[PDB]
């Protein structure tokens, strides 16, 4: 969503309960067209950040189906706000991020993920 | 405090503000006697961990006077408890907990800092 309503935050916007094999969870977003994608926001839960992921690793697919890993998964635990800018805005259709587990919660929570960028006459 | 009470976790039971220069705390305890000392326990603020600290270093000392530097400084952001074993015992009559600045807070908050170990005839 555009903006969530963020005034109390009871629970979260979104939970992910984590398998104890697994420790990475893809969030794939596939967009009508590609942008030119510039930084990605990423909005824990404000009110209980111990559910905020650990690590986040992006990536970006101009096709839309050929996905290609970012960068090093940045840390963002004890982070309330995660901005992830690229110095060259990268063409880009599919954006899949993958959350990694936190450091001692079983549970992500998430608020709102933002897309920003231009597009090619915007 | 052996056990405040932690139900509400109204804004912090300790709160400190960083100086934009300073990164660095430290809370120095100073025991009465020196204690077979073996895990250190710190509580950030169970309900608003954006001001948990990102790394502690411990300090120990024996005489109570010379400072000395534990281990290099465990990150602990994103952490709702810090268990800070130790694999040797250490005779520590005075303990240095010096706190880092959290990744985007100006403020810290804990709630409990527990000393656990023995004594000589306990």
Known sequence: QATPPHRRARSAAWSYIFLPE????????????????KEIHIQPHLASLATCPSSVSVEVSADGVNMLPLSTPVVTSGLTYIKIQLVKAEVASAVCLRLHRPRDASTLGLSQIKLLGLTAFG
């Open 22 to 37: 697994e420790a990475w969870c893809d969030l794939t977003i596939h967009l009508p067209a590609a942008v030119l994608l």
